[PDB]
Amino acid sequence: RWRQTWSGPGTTKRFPETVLARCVKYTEIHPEMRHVDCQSVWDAFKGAFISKHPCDITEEDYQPLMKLGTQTVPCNKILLWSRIKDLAHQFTQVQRDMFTLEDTLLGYLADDLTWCGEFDTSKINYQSCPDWRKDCSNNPVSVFWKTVSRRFAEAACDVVHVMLDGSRSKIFDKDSTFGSVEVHNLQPEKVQTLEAWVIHGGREDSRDLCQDPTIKELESIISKRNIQFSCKNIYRPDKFLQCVKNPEDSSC
C-alpha cells in the first residue's frame, strides 16, 4: 500500500518471537534472572500496547512488565550513553567493568526493536508506528524507553559514567533521553559524581571537548542537583578499547 497511517517504521518483523527468544537467551545466561518466566514477560509486554491507541500509551501500561523485569544492577557500575551506544556496548563486553541499560533484561529485550498496536483491534501494526516528532510522543516505543530509563537512572549510586558523542553538534543534548530523563532522575542522596567521557569522532589531535558549552551546561545542571561533575576526553576510541582489552600491554 502507498500511504501508511503513521510516519515511523512499523513493528519489527516477528516481534513476538524475537522478544520471547531474547528473553530465553537472557535468562539462560544471567543466573539472577534464571527463574523469570518468559511467557509471562511477553504477555506483560503485549499487554502494555496491544488494543491500545499507539498515541495514548502511559508509563502505567508498562508496569506489569516492569515488575516482571525487576532486576538488581550493581549501582556503582552504571554506564549511561547518549547517541553512542556501540562503543558503550563494546566497552562493557570486554570484562563487564560497567553495565548499560541494554545489559539489563528489559533493555536487552527491546534494543533495536520497534512495536505498536491499534486501538480496538488486538493486532500488532507491522506497517507503521507513530513517529515521536511527527505523530506523538506517547507511543509504545518512546514510553517504554522513558519508563525503563528513569528506573535505571534511579538505580545508580556512587560514580555514574556517561559516554557522550563528541562528534555531534550538541555533545550534551538536553532533548536526549540522557539529558531529559536520566540527568534528572539520578538520586543526589546516592550519586556522588557523574563522570562524562566525551568520545572524539575526529582523527587524532583535537580540542578539549570538556570545555564545550554543552558540557558546561551539563556540569551546571548536575552541580545544581548537588552531584559532582567530572569529564574526560577519549581522543581515540580505538586505542581506548585496545587498552581496556590489553591494559599496560601497550602504550596505554
Ligand SMILES: NC(=O)c1cccnc1
Ligand atoms: N537502546 C536504546 O535504543 C535506547 C534508546 C533510548 C533510551 N535508552 C535506550
